Amino acid sequence: CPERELQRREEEANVVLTGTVEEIMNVDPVHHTYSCKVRVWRYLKGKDIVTHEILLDGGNKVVIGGFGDPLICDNQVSTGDTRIFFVNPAPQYMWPAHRNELMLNSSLMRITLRNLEEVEHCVEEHRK
């Protein structure tokens, strides 16, 4: 499965965060996708966006849908998994199915210093 260059992935994602998958949510029969409740650790990008467009659960939990999407290479998660999430707020025309949800935009990434550093780097450059 081919994935896009990290630079384009950072581009097509207004929000990049890190967190833990606490629970698997319901399935989306229409798109053959599922959602999960995630406990956010830190935002690598788009924190302001999530603050003004998402109603948070317990102030540190978000729901991310889009898991299982065939077009995304690394797209599976289990309870307890920790990853870097490249996401976008759920668009209007996807309500109320995915209202108040972040949708996976690209492949999940493992938590390692290399990854954290590389992503911050691209978030840093592009931000100029």
UniProtKB/Swiss-Prot annotation:
Residues 1-128 form the NtA domain. Disulfide bonds join 1-73. Glycans are attached at residue 105. The record marks 115-116 as: Cleavage. It comes from the Eukaryota. Is involved in modulation of growth factor signaling. Involved also in the regulation of neurite outgrowth probably due to the presence of the glycosaminoglcan (GAG) side chains of heparan and chondroitin sulfate attached to the Ser/Thr- and Gly/Ser-rich regions. Also involved in modulation of growth factor signaling. This is Agrin N-terminal 110 kDa subunit. The lineage of its organism: Eukaryota, Metazoa, Chordata, Craniata, Vertebrata.
